[PDB]
Structure formats: C-alpha cells, structure tokens
C-alpha cells in the first residue's frame, strides 16, 4: 500500500506477458547477486481402526457370503459376555466412504421372532436406532445392540 504502491502498479500492469519473468530477472538478479552473493549452497483402514479398538465382548468378523474387496463391506459380529445372554449374530453393511455417512443394520425379523425375549431385544434395538444421531459409527450400533440386550434382560426381570 503506502510506500510500496508503484511496484505493485508496475507488476500488476505487466502480468500475462510471456517475457515477464525475463523482465524481473534482468531488472533484479544482478543487484541481488552482487549484494547477497551467489544463490543457495482392500478393506478401508477406518474400519480396521474401529475393529482394532473394540471391546472383547464383540467378535466382529467378515461374512463368508456377500461381495468382498469391493465398495461396501459386510460384517457378522457376535456377542460374548457372562452378564448378557446368547443372541442372534447381527449383520452389518458398511458402505464405502464410511465416515460422513451411517452404516446399515441388515434386519432379520424372522429370527427375532419365536421368543418373547428376542422380540424385546428387537423392539428396544429399533427404538435406540431411531434415537441415534446421524453419521454414527459402527461402534455406536454395536453398543446400542449391547445396551438393548441389557434392557431386554432387565425389563423381562
């Protein structure tokens, strides 16, 4: 701005000439080189990060079935915990570009029938799924699953 303007006017006047840097060189390099001397002397890794940090309750493994080494990935988890009862395995479909979007829980209504207890597990799980914020992780789904199993143990007894 002040005390520097005519340089700025000269250089902004003379941009887009192909001989521009020639002009700068010819007008500036002999002074500088006299004073200053001569010049100088398969699976996306976000999911591996999630699975590597899970609690040893969960036992997440890939589905033998379904497409592999391609966009989306598919998981069959498990649940081991003395406090919690054995439950249906749970099926997850993680999209490619996994963060910035929410994974999907593959619903299997037919195995969550044939007991009152698994029905309570399923109702409570769909409730906490509706309660979830958007763009949640895989671990949010797995933890809502474990909390759903715990509530269905407590509500029953």
């Amino acid at each position: 701005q002040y005390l520097c303007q005519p340089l700025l006017d000269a250089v902004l006047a003379n941009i887009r000439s192909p001989v521009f840097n020639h002009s700068l060189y010819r007008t500036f390099v002999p002074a500088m080189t006299a004073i200053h001397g001569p010049p100088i002397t398969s699976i996306p890794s976000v999911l591996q990060g999630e699975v590597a940090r899970l609690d040893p309750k969960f036992l997440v493994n890939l589905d033998p079935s379904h497409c592999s080494n391609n966009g989306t990935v598919h998981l069959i988890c498990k649940l081991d915990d003395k406090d919690l009862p054995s439950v249906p395995p749970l099926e997850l479909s993680v999209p490619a570009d996994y963060p910035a979007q929410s994974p999907l829980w593959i619903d299997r209504q037919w195995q969550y029938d044939a007991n009152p207890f698994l029905q309570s597990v399923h109702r409570c799980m769909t409730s906490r799924l509706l309660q979830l914020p958007d763009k949640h992780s895989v671990t949010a789904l797995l933890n809502t699953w474990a909390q759903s199993v715990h509530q269905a143990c407590l509500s029953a007894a």
Binding site: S17, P18, V19, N21, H22, L24, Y25, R26, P30, A34
Partner: protein
C-alpha cells in the same frame, strides 16, 4: 560380437493376462527414432493400438501415439526421409502420421487410405529414385565422390519433371494391391486392383523396386508346398487417376519339399523378404515347422529365360522368430567382397535371425553361414538393424526393448588404425547423407577419440570447396558429439556449440542489413564489413566505425529493437571471454582463434552503429563507474587480443599489458554468468562396454531459452522444446508474434542448430 547397450522395460504394466499375444511391428528411421507397438493389455485394448516413438538417445522418454486402429497394427514404415510414418492394420486403414509443429513428440495423421475389411499384409513407400553405393575399397581415396556414388536408379511414377511422386503401395490378404499417390497439394489418389485374375490367399507378401520404375511384389499363402508367386506392378497416372498394371513373373517352389527323405516337415513359410528394397532379384524365405526352420536365398538370374535358382540355405535351426535385413547399401561386387573380407568390414553383410530360444545369429547375406552368435541371458519378437548397421534394436516376448551393438568386424580383434578407418568411413557416410551417427558413437572407445577427430578434420580439408561449404555444421556437430566421449576431450564440446551459435548469429546479422544503395558494387555489405574490419586494425571503435558508410547499416527501429537479446549475448560473451583470459574453461579455445575474434569485432562494430541509430538495442553492462564507455573498452581489449592471432604463422602468447587490463575487468564491470549448451543427458557418455543399463520407461536415470536468449523463471510457466542431441531449450510458441525477428526464429523451426530434432518437454507443476 554383441553387447547389450541397454534394456528398457515397462514398470508394472507388463503381465498381460487372459488375452493372447499379437505380432509386433518395429521401424528404425533414418533419424534415430524407433516406432514400435507392444502388447500392453491393461484396462484397454488400445494399449495394444498405441505406437511408441522412442528417440534412441533418451529412451526413458517414450511418446505414445494413440492410433485409432480398430484392429491390430500389422505394418509400420518410415519415410525415405525420417519425417512421416505409415501404419497399417488389419481391416484396411493405412494412416500417414506426420509431425505436429515439427516436434518429434506430436504426431497426427491427416492422410490415409482404406480398403475396408481386407487386412494389409505388406506396405511400402514408393521409391524416390535416390540410391547410392559404398565402395569400401576406396575408403582412403580422399574424395567423397569416390567413396559413395549414386547408381542411376529410376523412381516409380515421375511427374512432370525429374520429381518423383510420394505415395505408398499396400498388398492385402486377398489378391488386392492399392497405390495411393500424394500430390504436392493435399490431394491423394487411390487405386486398388487385383494382382492376378485367379484371386487367392496372400498370407505373406513383400515389395521391392527395380530400375525402370517397376514394383515387384511377392506373394505366398503360407503353405510352403505352394509356389511363391511374383508380380510386376507398374504405376501410372492417367489424366486424373492412378492406374495399376500387373503382370505375372516366374514363381518359385521351395527346397525341403523335394528333399524326399522327410519332406513333410517345415510346412509353413513364415517370413518372405527381399534382401533389400531396390534389390528385387534376391529373395529370402524361411520355412518353419513347430520347432525347426530353414532360411533360403534365391535369385532370379537368367539363362525359360528367367528362372529362380537357389543360392544357399541353412542346415537346421531353431524356430526363427524375427528377421532383420541390413540397410547399409554396400556395393556387393567381387573386389569389394574381397577387400571387406581382408580388412574385416562386416556392417552390410549381415542379417540377424532371432530364434525361439534366447539366441540371435548374425549370418552372411550371400552364403548363409553364421558370422556371430549372441545368447540372451524369452525371445525377440521384433528386430531391426540400424541404418549404419552397427546396432540392432529388438522387442522381446515381454515388455523389454533392448539395443545391441554389433562390432564392425564381428568380434575379431583389429588393430586401431583399421578400426579408426572403419568408423571414419561410416561417419563420412553419415556426413554425406544426413543420417544420424549415434550408433557409431556406441562403438567409439575413449582412447581413440582424439585421433578420430584429427582424421575428420583432415577429411574436411582436401574436398572440393563446395563440400567444405555444405559439410560445415555437420562436422561441427560430429566433432562435438565425438569429443563428448572422452575425459581428456570433454572440455572442448562447449566451444564447438558456441562456435555454431556464433556463426548462427554472425551471418544472420549480416543477413539483416539490406544496403539501401549499391556503393562500391560487387561486394555485399557483409564482405565490405569484413574487409574494412580486417584492414583497419585501429584499437578505437570510433576509427573503425568512421570508415564504414554508416547510412547503409539501417534497420526499421522495430526489428532493431527486437534484436536486443542476441546483441546482449554478443556483448556478454565478449566480456566473459576477456575476463576469462587471465586463467581449461568454457572459453579456452576462442582466445587463440583469430577468425572468431574477428567475427566478434565485426559484431561489436555493427552493434555500435545500431546503438547510435537506436540506443535501446544495445547490451547493458552494470558498470562500477558512470563516466565509462564499456563497448569501447571491450573493443580495445578485443583488438589487442586479436592482433595477436591475425598474424601470419603467429601463435603469439598474449603480453602482460592485456593480462593486467583484463584483470581489471571484474573491477570495472560485472561478469554476469553464461549458459553453455550441451547439458549432457546422452546415454553414450554414460554407457560402458560389458555393462548394460537397465532402465524403466518414464523413469529417467537458471533455466534459459538458449536460442532466443530469454530468461525463464525458476519453474517456467510457458512450455518448451528440447533438442535431442545438444539439449538446448526453447519455448514452444514465440513470446511476441508481432515483434519477432523471423530471420532468426524461422531458422530453427524444424531443427536445432546442432541438427537434432525438437522434442516437447513436460511442465513441472511443483
């Protein structure tokens, strides 16, 4: 003998899977550019339809023309010059690629033929009637007319003058032949006609030419128990249109079918080749079974008047996978066979036969006895010898492209004078023609380099004063490229390139001055200036400038201003040279050359005159004083140096007054810096015998424009061409199309000054 100069492989782009191989083409031009196709087969089949152009001195930089050939490319074929490339595939479609903006990196085809659905099986440019023969027994004869002589050949289809038409002739897998004639205008005439009335399969074909302007095309249908038929084709132009006249010639059958012991083996003729195009009387055939093969040579020789008789045949081989015939046109008669056997000259007498094991056999032309053997340590699917036949290029049954050097005596040890005379003979052959001499520099050892340079200069003398005119810049380029190859002589190459540049400026400045009126006629103002500067030895610049009719030295003050950067180089080189005097450096040769210092004087005088007309054209010197006339100072020191060397038989060592005055020059002015042209990335200096370079494609194991002396930035924004031999860089399009000294810019459109081609360099984008 055989040494692998280098092996260039693709990186990770090999392992073609699930689609089978295809035959490859390969074509080595007169300029050293290989055009070849390969089976890349990754994510597209157009990777088998790309034509790779590889300049043989910088192999990493491989250009890849994406040819629009819907089927596989059968044939590639360079011009008689090196400037166009014919490529034809199955289903017709001959395309004629030409350079775009005279870059060897941009090809584009505007012209082509099309015989749809029929696969082209032979393709050739028409013959332009130039043929020369090399007399090896006159290698010492001290005149180039005795060594290389034109042999009175006639071009097929001469049109209204002595001038041949350019065009091609292709032979399809049916009986069809087609001729396309390119006009001097953009028009193209095509005609197709069957070869004979009995239309039949042509599985292999070849094309030679004759004296008399007749094409001779040989056809075979691969069966090896059926005759190899022959046709004479005569082209004509009837009033608007091409016209083809064919005629049957004597066919031949093949031996190993009349063998009668076991005749059923070798059932496939796999290669048919005339021994050279324009040598239509001899034919090389190659019958093959699944494992073994036979090559044979036949000749038409008359006694039935004309009748094919066999010359020779090999005993039994492996299955021949590729065949390369030589291109060096030796004179082939009996005395020259004798002297080339005595003095072991073997460049034009070899064919190369690859095999289905690794081996490669260089075998004699006339009686096919093996001259050398190279074991690869996988087979060569395409081979091509070079135009001086000292190196053979070859594409393997992988991505690998290798260049082998064949010694000119095939491994038999020669004394140094004979090797000198052989390589000197070849360099003279490349000097008379315009072909490139790179393959020769594969064979030049360092320890002989200096002696070779001496011989070149002695052969540059004793020619007849017009050859000395036309071979000036060729012998400067050959001298520089030879002196690159040895550590004792590596210092001089910069001098040679500046010498070229000096002449390239000097004449052009003397070209620009158009004398407004002829005073003292019969001497052009270049010669008046040189006479006046050589008789007037005055140390002042004013006293020389007075006597030079300075109303003649006038320009329009526009081009006179645009000459600023060339005049800047002149002044800066003079100042650098005079400051370099007190000290082997980039200027050491010029201090004792009287002629170049005379030229620098003449340019300083015309710079002074042009500065008086317009002061902006002058070079600038950052002076450490303000009451100084820097041009007159440098001219005083230049005259005092030059009067040392303009003496007759002098060699006067420079006196101490000049030494102390030129020690004062960094005090009075600032000696800037200069760019010296051969930024050496050539392989021939880098290579060693018995050690092959293993390269990857595209891997490639203070920025100026050297021709228009413009400083590009640190990372330049405008794109550039690089010369392929010296290495000079110019920006591609001119900076100011209005103010452009076209007398200087239009000299280097098609080549550099050293002679090499331009080659587009990619931008950095850091």
């Amino acid at each position: 003998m055989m040494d692998l100069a280098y092996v260039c492989e693709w990186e990770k782009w090999s392992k073609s899977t699930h689609c089978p191989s295809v035959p490859l083409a390969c074509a080595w031009s007169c300029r050293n550019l290989i055009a070849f196709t390969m089976d890349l087969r990754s994510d597209d089949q157009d990777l088998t339809r790309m034509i790779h152009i590889l300049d043989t001195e910088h192999p990493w930089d491989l250009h890849s023309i994406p040819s629009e050939h819907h089927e596989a490319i059968t044939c590639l074929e360079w011009d008689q010059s090196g400037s166009r490339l014919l490529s034809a595939d199955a289903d017709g479609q001959i395309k004629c690629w030409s350079m775009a903006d005279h870059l060897a990196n941009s090809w584009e085809s505007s012209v082509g033929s099309l015989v749809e659905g029929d696969p082209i099986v032979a393709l050739s440019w028409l013959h332009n009637g130039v043929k020369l023969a090399l007399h090896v027994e006159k290698s010492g004869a001290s005149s180039f007319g005795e060594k290389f002589s034109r042999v009175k050949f006639s071009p097929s289809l001469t049109l209204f003058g002595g001038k041949p038409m350019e065009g091609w002739i292709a032979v399809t897998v049916s009986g069809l032949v087609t001729v396309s004639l390119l006009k001097p205008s953009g028009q193209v005439l095509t005609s197709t006609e069957s070869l004979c009335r009995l239309r039949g399969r042509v599985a292999l074909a070849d094309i030679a030419f004759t004296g008399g302007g007749n094409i001779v095309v040989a056809t075979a249908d691969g069966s090896s128990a059926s005759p190899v038929q022959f046709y004479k084709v005569c082209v004509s132009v009837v009033s608007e249109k091409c016209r083809i006249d064919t005629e049957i010639l004597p066919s031949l059958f093949m031996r190993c079918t009349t063998d009668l012991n076991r005749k059923d083996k070798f059932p496939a003729i796999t290669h048919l080749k005339f021994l050279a195009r324009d040598m239509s009387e001899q034919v090389l055939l190659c019958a093959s079974s699944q494992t073994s093969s036979i090559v044979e040579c036949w000749s038409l020789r008359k006694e039935t008047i004309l009748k094919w008789r066999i010359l020779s045949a090999t005993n039994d081989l492996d299955r021949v996978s590729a065949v390369a015939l030589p291109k060096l046109p030796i004179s082939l008669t009996n005395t020259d066979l004798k002297v080339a056997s005595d003095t072991q000259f073997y460049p034009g007498l070899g064919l190369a036969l690859a095999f289905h094991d690794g081996s490669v056999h260089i075998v004699h032309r006339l009686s096919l006895q093996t001259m050398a053997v190279f074991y690869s340590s996988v087979h060569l699917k395409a081979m091509q010898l070079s135009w001086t036949s000292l190196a053979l290029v070859g594409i393997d049954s992988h991505g690998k492209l290798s260049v082998l050097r064949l010694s000119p005596s095939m491994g038999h040890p020669l004394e140094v004078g004979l090797a000198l005379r052989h390589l000197l003979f070849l360099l003279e052959y490349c000097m008379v023609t315009g072909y490139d001499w790179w393959d020769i520099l594969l064979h030049v050892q360092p320890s002989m380099v200096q002696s070779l340079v001496e011989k070149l200069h002695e052969e540059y003398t004793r020619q007849t004063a017009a050859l000395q005119q036309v071979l000036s810049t060729r012998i400067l380029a050959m001298k520089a490229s030879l002196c690159k190859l040895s550590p004792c002589t590596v210092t001089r190459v910069c001098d040679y390139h500046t010498k070229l540049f000096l002449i390239a400026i000097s004449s052009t400045l003397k070209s620009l001055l158009r004398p407004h009126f002829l005073n003292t006629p019969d001497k052009s103002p270049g010669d008046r200036l040189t006479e006046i500067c050589t008789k007037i030895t005055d140390v002042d610049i004013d006293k020389v400038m007075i006597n030079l009719k300075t109303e003649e030295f006038v320009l329009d003050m526009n081009t006179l201003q645009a000459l600023q950067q060339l005049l800047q180089w002149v002044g800066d080189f003079v100042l650098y040279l005079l400051a370099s005097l007190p000290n082997l450096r980039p200027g050491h040769s010029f201090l004792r050359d009287g002629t170049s210092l005379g030229m620098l004087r003449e340019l300083m005088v015309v710079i002074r005159i042009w500065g008086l007309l317009k002061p902006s054209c002058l070079p600038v010197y950052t002076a450490t004083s303000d009451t100084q006339d820097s041009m007159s100072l440098l001219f005083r020191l230049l005259t005092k140096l030059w009067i040392c060397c303009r003496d007759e038989g002098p060699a006067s060592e420079p006196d101490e007054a000049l030494v102390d005055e030129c020690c004062l020059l960094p005090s009075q002015l600032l000696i800037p810096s200069l760019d010296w042209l051969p930024a050496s990335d050539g392989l021939v200096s880098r290579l060693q015998p018995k050690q092959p370079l293993r390269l990857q494609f595209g891997r490639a194991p203070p920025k100026i424009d050297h021709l228009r002396r413009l400083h590009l930035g640190a990372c330049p924004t405008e794109e550039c061409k690089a010369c392929t031999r010296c290495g000079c860089v110019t920006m591609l399009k001119s900076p100011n199309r209005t103010t452009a000294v076209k007398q200087w810019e239009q000299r280097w459109i098609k080549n550099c000054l050293c002679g090499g081609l331009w080659w587009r360099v990619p931008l950095s984008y850091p």
